[PDB]
Amino acid sequence: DPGCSELIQASSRITTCSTEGVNTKCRLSGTALIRAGSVGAEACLMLKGVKEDQ
Amino acid sequence: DPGCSELIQASSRITTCSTEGVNTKCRLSGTALIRAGSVGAEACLMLKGVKEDQ
Fold it and tell me: What is its subcellular localisation (chains A, B) (predicted)?
């Protein structure tokens, strides 16, 4: 029933992107750590691309 | 004498871009409000594209 709880920002050393045919295809290859919540909570994560809307 | 001072981002809804001949060109068509600088300061504007160096 509930949703997310902890939201952190991913790193940029292992996050690259590329635009082909007016479309940004980002590549992810590395290892990151995230904090887990309590019961019901969700360990969500967001990522930003080359723009502010994608 | 001094460089830029008041810096603000640009609106992506009125800014389009296209890649032609390995040259990602962009066009600007719209209005934007920014605060003017003081005596000697500058009113610079930031503009991005699809990569990190453009």
Answer: Host Golgi apparatus membrane; Host endoplasmic reticulum membrane; Virion membrane
